Amino acid sequence: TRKESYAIYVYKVLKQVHPDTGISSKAMSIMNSFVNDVFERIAGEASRLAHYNKRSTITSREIQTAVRLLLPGELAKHAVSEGTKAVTKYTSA
Amino acid sequence: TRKESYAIYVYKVLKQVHPDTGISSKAMSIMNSFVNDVFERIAGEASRLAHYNKRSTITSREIQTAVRLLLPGELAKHAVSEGTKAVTKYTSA
Amino acid sequence: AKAKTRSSRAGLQFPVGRVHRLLRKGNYAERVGAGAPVYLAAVLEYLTAEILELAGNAARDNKKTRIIPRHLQLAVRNDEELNKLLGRVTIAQGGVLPNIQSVLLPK
Amino acid sequence: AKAKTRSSRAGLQFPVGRVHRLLRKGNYAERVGAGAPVYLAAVLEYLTAEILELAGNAARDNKKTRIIPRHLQLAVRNDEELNKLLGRVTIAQGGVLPNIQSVLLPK
Amino acid sequence: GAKRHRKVLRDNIQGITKPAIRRLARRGGVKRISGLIYEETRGVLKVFLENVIRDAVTYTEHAKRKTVTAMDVVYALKRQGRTLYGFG
Amino acid sequence: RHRKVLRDNIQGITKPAIRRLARRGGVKRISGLIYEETRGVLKVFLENVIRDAVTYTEHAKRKTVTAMDVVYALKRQGRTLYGFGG
Amino acid sequence: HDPESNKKRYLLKDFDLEGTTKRFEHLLSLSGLFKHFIESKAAKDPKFRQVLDVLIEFQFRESPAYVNGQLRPYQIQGVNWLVSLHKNKIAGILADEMGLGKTLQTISFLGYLRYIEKIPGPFLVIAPKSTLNNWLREINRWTPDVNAFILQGDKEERAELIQKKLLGCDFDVVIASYEIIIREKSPLKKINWEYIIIDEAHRIKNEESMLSQVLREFTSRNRLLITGTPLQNNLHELWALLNFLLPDIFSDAQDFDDWFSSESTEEDQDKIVKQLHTVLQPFLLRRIKSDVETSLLPKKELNLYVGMSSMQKKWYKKILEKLLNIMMQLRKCCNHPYLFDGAEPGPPYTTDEHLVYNAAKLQVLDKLLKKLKEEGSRVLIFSQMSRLLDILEDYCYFRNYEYCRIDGSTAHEDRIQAIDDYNAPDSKKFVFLLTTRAGGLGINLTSADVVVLYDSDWNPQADLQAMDRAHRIGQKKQVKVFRLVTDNSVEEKILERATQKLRLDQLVIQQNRTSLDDIDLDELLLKSENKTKSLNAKYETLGLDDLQKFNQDSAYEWNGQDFKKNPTKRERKENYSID
Amino acid sequence: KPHRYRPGTVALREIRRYQKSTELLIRKLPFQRLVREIAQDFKTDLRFQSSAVMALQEASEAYLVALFEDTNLCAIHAKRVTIMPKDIQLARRIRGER
Amino acid sequence: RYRPGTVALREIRRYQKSTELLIRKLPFQRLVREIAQDFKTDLRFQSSAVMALQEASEAYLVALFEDTNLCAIHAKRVTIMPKDIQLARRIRGER
DNA sequence: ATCGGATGTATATATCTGACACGTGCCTGGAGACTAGGGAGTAATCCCCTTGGCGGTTAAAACGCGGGGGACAGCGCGTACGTGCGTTTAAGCGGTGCTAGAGCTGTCTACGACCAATTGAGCGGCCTCGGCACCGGGATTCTCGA
DNA sequence: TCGAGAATCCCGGTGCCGAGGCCGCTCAATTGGTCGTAGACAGCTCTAGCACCGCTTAAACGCACGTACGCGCTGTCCCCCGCGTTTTAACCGCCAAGGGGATTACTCCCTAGTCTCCAGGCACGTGTCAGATATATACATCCGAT
Ligand SMILES: Nc1ncnc2c1ncn2[C@@H]1O[C@H](COP(=O)(O)OP(=O)(O)O)[C@@H](O)[C@H]1O
Ligand SMILES: [Mg+2]
């Protein structure tokens, strides 16, 4: 009966952004649906993008191009920067 | 080199529904893109439908449901009739 | 052991083997059934014939033999079902349906 | 040796391994890279941090200390680009931004 | 007597009472409402409901069930392009 | 390339062309302030589609914008185009 | 005494072994089997075990002087029993028959509590709404010098009473209805409640009723239950009553079940019944209805085993094979086929004899009604579905008799007007249609003499109440119950289950108070009565362990059942010419 | 003569109080009956979950609120303040439904 | 001399019957490759790319003008004005 | 109403150019073993559904009425468009050259897939105690007739 | 024009319920090792995109003038809103019994995938003709002024 969800991760992000602020169950479910929806959008865009170029791997470059295509304007660049940051850190250890 | 296309089959259908007319090259390109678009929509809907139900295979049942779910009104029932006709004729051979 | 195409067995005109390959290599599912390509090819053939007969009728109404994108646009837009199916689609070198609002006409 | 989660390795809060599994099982491509889950998890974390901060500010404005769907709706619809991202979405138990046309107001 | 012919049970669409449409219009932000709005609103609501429920029933019938779930309605709405957050 | 970048090309979408588009759209009488609005909306639409097409072509490590790139951009924007491949 | 002074005693401005020790001391004077429950809930609840480890006679012969008028001797013994129960730190339920008089006994007990040991309240009385007024009168009539109020009305009236008298403590009795008790618990949760009295304790049967939980949230120094019939259908409801009455003792449902019911011992019989009689004797008091009254003559209950009609058989078999989503549909078909949509032949509709012969039960019903019309009686059909009751009303019109219908949708003033006009002196009112579970208990159909249960209920208590609607104190001529049953059908199953429930009730509770085409109706009646005697002789000698078997022989079968039951080319556009 | 509010000053108060709350403005039971009636015309003998009806109600109410916003815009565009069926039809036709 | 409105209707009937493009090719190509330089330097365009852009653009403009005409008619006029375009775009969801 | 123009609208003829037919080959779809795992079927089970009916509360909804203000029609007018003429001016095509820059072919290597054990992380069940909802009550503010 | 009057808001108090710590388990992530095979780089080729550049010539532009349409103002109904009964339907709480769908666990079988060959089907490159322009050309067919 185990059901995976992004509840604890959303809670951790909230408690590192607003250290003293809770969240109701309905708001948590809305946040989980939002995360799932955005994940599906980006993954689908990257999948189609890789299919266009006759590739078989979804790599970080496809994810960057997809997030650049979807997220509007000034919201994209920050996200893009964040992504690159993580990858660099991840490839240092 | 050797770009695949649907021209030959569309022409074979045309010379059985209107066996005197012709078709221009631009019209052939439009028909080819239309066939590709409809194929992609039906296949994507079927894949998502199979993913919802935890199945790992695409069968005639998912294709039938996707057809009933994308085409409007009478087109859906006519397409379903044609598909079941073809499947029952195929399995008996 | 003579080879018979699956299209011949199913009595269709569209290719079943090509549709099977496109389904398999398109990353739609882990496995693909046997009747799925047949059913999908039959549906595609039906839709193509349905649109293409209306296009031919429109071509004949304009005293023409070969159909051009204008006839396809007329056939799609005049028919309610296909106009709903291709609602968000623009057709190259098409046009518009002849339609003038009645208020604009002279009295 | 000693285990280290890829999330902590990349300094993230979202699960990199779970994202990798959902990416392989979702039938998106035959293969997935090694940095794709990291990049996607970082992007998701950034977006959720943005929306959560806006919602927390909105909730604080109402003198309340829990986030409720009203605050999420109010935070999303008040940011133009976050609202472009979620233009076609409806938030259950959300509402409508206070908006009265100036023509309707008393003279 | 002939009372075995109970009643029409007038109509369920008339259950969407005029005050309900007025409240929805107020939330939309309108000041005055013509008397003929209450029929057009019921018509458009019924059309939208049929469109959504057809897809929901198709989804729940493919799954070989007999109980329409919240997830089925969510899938139907997403298919129509009206993504709904808060139900899974 | 380096082709002596120009200006006022939005004025190249001239008044008679907008009038012809309006006549095809079924418009009988046209106000005189409508041309600037038409130019503005045209510029916005072109900017969006071209931005998406340029992103698609940059991802492929190319320098030439192809018709398929424009078709993909339009499809992503919900404006499917038939007749240029795909 | 004084309002302000009384505020110190009523309002609660602030493991209770203190009275528990004495309770157990007196209770263990009986058989040690009583401690069994305790010796269970000492392992589960060690903190309450601290009592088991360590371990006035007031006859009140004559009627109380303070009460007005004389008091009947059996009610005298009732109040004696109540006083004895009080002076033991225990509580019991009173289960006298309806019409024998219980409110008088309770108010005399309250007069005792106020005048002999001097505790003027507080007292809470919970009663059905229709009964509420019928309290104040007696409170004002038998012991006038006591104040009480009904605590009823809309939000404004109730809130005004709460602020004015309840919190003001200008009261002794706060008689209030069930829904009001649920509505305002917070203002009523702090009175410290010397006693709580629940008339018609049938409502407090389900342990998880909202009313049940609300009452368990109260604080009372002692409780009491008034009910006409405990143990209506099952046993577990009796345990629920006892648990509410004494929560420190009957605290484990599974104990009471497994010890007696949930696992029936391989013992034959006649031991566990003595166990139960010993257990319940100190707690439950009951008297036979016919004990001290005489007059009313016993009821001549009868069965009519009607067959079934051709259309009725066709429809019933149609139902058996598989828009219809319950077994109760079968009950509809054996009741009257016209309830289904389409049974009526022809979209023009008539009211001639074309329906009497189409229904099996109504044929015999018509024959009996005619025989009584040229015999001079009055009937009280108690069908269970208002829709069939409507069909029967249309029948009554066709045959040209006089209606009187009181369903569950009949307004209160219409209810009382119908009761008055029918109960009036000589009048043209032959039949009185009424649905079995309607009117509560304040209906007084004493004028008529013949009752026809058109259908049978799941629990026989409802049918007993229907019978008491005409067999109460008053009507003194004859009573004739004429329940109709369709043989070879699910009605047999329902009748069997009802009979087994009634027999279980007779065994458990009714043994303590001992020490305390036309069918030629004559031959049909003879064979039906013979079959009734057959079932009685069959099932009277059955065992207690079998009484709870609930054989549940499926009626879905009944005869042998396996439990298994072009393209059209579209419209096309005509002309495609641009011109 | 009891005080009386001028026509249109209670409409504004209703506007600004219903546009601040979040609750559903349609009664639950009538909507549930309507949903069941519509559904039983597609395939007989369906049953719903409470959550399905709730989600469907949220979606429909959001749809109607958006439609009424566009209707108000259409009415104001025509130098009016009263919304009329012409406006609903124009909004729906522009929006793409019909 | 004709009266105002006759020639407008003749042009309406003329341009709803033809299928070609109503914008000159060089002006549109110059506009496209001026806009595109805001996103990447030294970009080359195939002819087919500019042709697809032009056809999509003209289809969009015609579809917008139909809604503008309907809005102006709804407001009891026959002349389309900028507020009609703004209302159509706002209702359709673009603004 | 009738007549004088301007404009589509049929009608015949020449073109060409785009569609149709025909020859090659290569690559992909079909035939035939072999296999294993996905899915169909069986069976507990159990929690929640079904229908028919009852009792009571309490807001919401329905109906009636008065009266204000808003829509709708009509009139006047005065700009702002449409229509027709001359005159340039910029598109559209043919022609030319240059070369970046897509597109195809070979190698190999670094990187993802697969597999076996292991273990921490995440999910389910449970308890409780603060945050938010509800209810006076008191003050504030906007409204509407003077 | 100010003085009631009504509605809203902001404070206290309950009180109750659900969010948020806390504990057990089990099962996906992680680590380590082996193994193909995408794709990345290097190389070669030939193709079309960039850049002018002249001719032509057809549309764009500026200009006049003269209707007619958009806008503003005025009257007049009429219809919708605000307010006051009062009636009913939603909404709980109940009763009575089924049985019926949805959800875990096992079992196994048959239908996919994976190979290995090997011939036809289809895509590319050609070489023809007839269907649709383009001009003219005469005909019929609205529009507008008397
Ligand atoms: N002096 C009296 N002694 C005993 N009973 C009396 C006396 N006076 C009246 N009664 C009866 O006591 C009855 C109370 O019983 P009832 O009202 O049926 O309720 P319940 O059945 O719950 O006791 C009344 O009907 C009334 O007729
Ligand atoms: Mg009584």
PDB file of N, CA and C in Angstrom, chain A residues 69-93:
ATOM      1  N   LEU A  69      13.017  25.941 -23.020  1.00  0.00           N
ATOM      2  CA  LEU A  69      11.849  26.073 -23.884  1.00  0.00           C
ATOM      3  C   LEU A  69      10.571  26.295 -23.087  1.00  0.00           C
ATOM      4  N   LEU A  70      10.447  25.662 -21.924  1.00  0.00           N
ATOM      5  CA  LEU A  70       9.195  25.733 -21.179  1.00  0.00           C
ATOM      6  C   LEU A  70       9.107  26.949 -20.269  1.00  0.00           C
ATOM      7  N   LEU A  71      10.050  27.101 -19.351  1.00  0.00           N
ATOM      8  CA  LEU A  71       9.933  28.153 -18.354  1.00  0.00           C
ATOM      9  C   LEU A  71       9.985  29.524 -19.022  1.00  0.00           C
ATOM     10  N   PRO A  72       9.125  30.457 -18.610  1.00  0.00           N
ATOM     11  CA  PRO A  72       8.972  31.718 -19.346  1.00  0.00           C
ATOM     12  C   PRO A  72      10.028  32.733 -18.938  1.00  0.00           C
ATOM     13  N   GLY A  73      10.835  33.148 -19.900  1.00  0.00           N
ATOM     14  CA  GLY A  73      11.639  34.347 -19.746  1.00  0.00           C
ATOM     15  C   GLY A  73      12.580  34.294 -18.565  1.00  0.00           C
ATOM     16  N   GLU A  74      12.474  35.304 -17.704  1.00  0.00           N
ATOM     17  CA  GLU A  74      13.463  35.512 -16.657  1.00  0.00           C
ATOM     18  C   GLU A  74      13.434  34.404 -15.611  1.00  0.00           C
ATOM     19  N   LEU A  75      12.333  33.658 -15.517  1.00  0.00           N
ATOM     20  CA  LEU A  75      12.293  32.504 -14.627  1.00  0.00           C
ATOM     21  C   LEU A  75      13.189  31.375 -15.105  1.00  0.00           C
ATOM     22  N   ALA A  76      13.422  31.267 -16.413  1.00  0.00           N
ATOM     23  CA  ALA A  76      14.206  30.153 -16.929  1.00  0.00           C
ATOM     24  C   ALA A  76      15.663  30.259 -16.510  1.00  0.00           C
ATOM     25  N   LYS A  77      16.274  31.431 -16.706  1.00  0.00           N
ATOM     26  CA  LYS A  77      17.719  31.543 -16.552  1.00  0.00           C
ATOM     27  C   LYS A  77      18.158  31.126 -15.156  1.00  0.00           C
ATOM     28  N   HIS A  78      17.481  31.636 -14.123  1.00  0.00           N
ATOM     29  CA  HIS A  78      17.804  31.221 -12.763  1.00  0.00           C
ATOM     30  C   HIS A  78      17.781  29.710 -12.654  1.00  0.00           C
ATOM     31  N   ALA A  79      16.673  29.100 -13.081  1.00  0.00           N
ATOM     32  CA  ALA A  79      16.573  27.649 -13.050  1.00  0.00           C
ATOM     33  C   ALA A  79      17.761  27.026 -13.756  1.00  0.00           C
ATOM     34  N   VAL A  80      18.051  27.501 -14.968  1.00  0.00           N
ATOM     35  CA  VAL A  80      19.169  26.953 -15.723  1.00  0.00           C
ATOM     36  C   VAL A  80      20.442  27.052 -14.903  1.00  0.00           C
ATOM     37  N   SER A  81      20.712  28.240 -14.357  1.00  0.00           N
ATOM     38  CA  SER A  81      21.906  28.408 -13.539  1.00  0.00           C
ATOM     39  C   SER A  81      21.931  27.372 -12.432  1.00  0.00           C
ATOM     40  N   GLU A  82      20.825  27.260 -11.690  1.00  0.00           N
ATOM     41  CA  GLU A  82      20.769  26.307 -10.593  1.00  0.00           C
ATOM     42  C   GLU A  82      21.171  24.929 -11.078  1.00  0.00           C
ATOM     43  N   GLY A  83      20.560  24.482 -12.177  1.00  0.00           N
ATOM     44  CA  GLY A  83      20.872  23.159 -12.678  1.00  0.00           C
ATOM     45  C   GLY A  83      22.357  22.989 -12.901  1.00  0.00           C
ATOM     46  N   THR A  84      22.961  23.922 -13.641  1.00  0.00           N
ATOM     47  CA  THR A  84      24.381  23.803 -13.927  1.00  0.00           C
ATOM     48  C   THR A  84      25.170  23.699 -12.638  1.00  0.00           C
ATOM     49  N   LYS A  85      24.867  24.572 -11.675  1.00  0.00           N
ATOM     50  CA  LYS A  85      25.546  24.529 -10.390  1.00  0.00           C
ATOM     51  C   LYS A  85      25.582  23.106  -9.866  1.00  0.00           C
ATOM     52  N   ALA A  86      24.398  22.505  -9.718  1.00  0.00           N
ATOM     53  CA  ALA A  86      24.315  21.174  -9.139  1.00  0.00           C
ATOM     54  C   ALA A  86      25.230  20.217  -9.878  1.00  0.00           C
ATOM     55  N   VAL A  87      25.134  20.204 -11.208  1.00  0.00           N
ATOM     56  CA  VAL A  87      25.895  19.233 -11.983  1.00  0.00           C
ATOM     57  C   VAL A  87      27.377  19.394 -11.696  1.00  0.00           C
ATOM     58  N   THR A  88      27.864  20.637 -11.713  1.00  0.00           N
ATOM     59  CA  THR A  88      29.280  20.853 -11.445  1.00  0.00           C
ATOM     60  C   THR A  88      29.646  20.300 -10.082  1.00  0.00           C
ATOM     61  N   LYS A  89      28.861  20.647  -9.062  1.00  0.00           N
ATOM     62  CA  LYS A  89      29.142  20.117  -7.738  1.00  0.00           C
ATOM     63  C   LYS A  89      29.101  18.601  -7.763  1.00  0.00           C
ATOM     64  N   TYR A  90      28.095  18.037  -8.428  1.00  0.00           N
ATOM     65  CA  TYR A  90      27.972  16.589  -8.459  1.00  0.00           C
ATOM     66  C   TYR A  90      29.148  15.952  -9.174  1.00  0.00           C
ATOM     67  N   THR A  91      29.720  16.632 -10.163  1.00  0.00           N
ATOM     68  CA  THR A  91      30.836  16.010 -10.858  1.00  0.00           C
ATOM     69  C   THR A  91      32.167  16.297 -10.185  1.00  0.00           C
ATOM     70  N   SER A  92      32.175  17.060  -9.093  1.00  0.00           N
ATOM     71  CA  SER A  92      33.406  17.263  -8.345  1.00  0.00           C
ATOM     72  C   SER A  92      33.635  16.187  -7.295  1.00  0.00           C
ATOM     73  N   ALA A  93      32.574  15.548  -6.815  1.00  0.00           N
ATOM     74  CA  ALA A  93      32.693  14.501  -5.811  1.00  0.00           C
ATOM     75  C   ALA A  93      32.474  13.126  -6.432  1.00  0.00           C
TER      76      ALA A  93
END
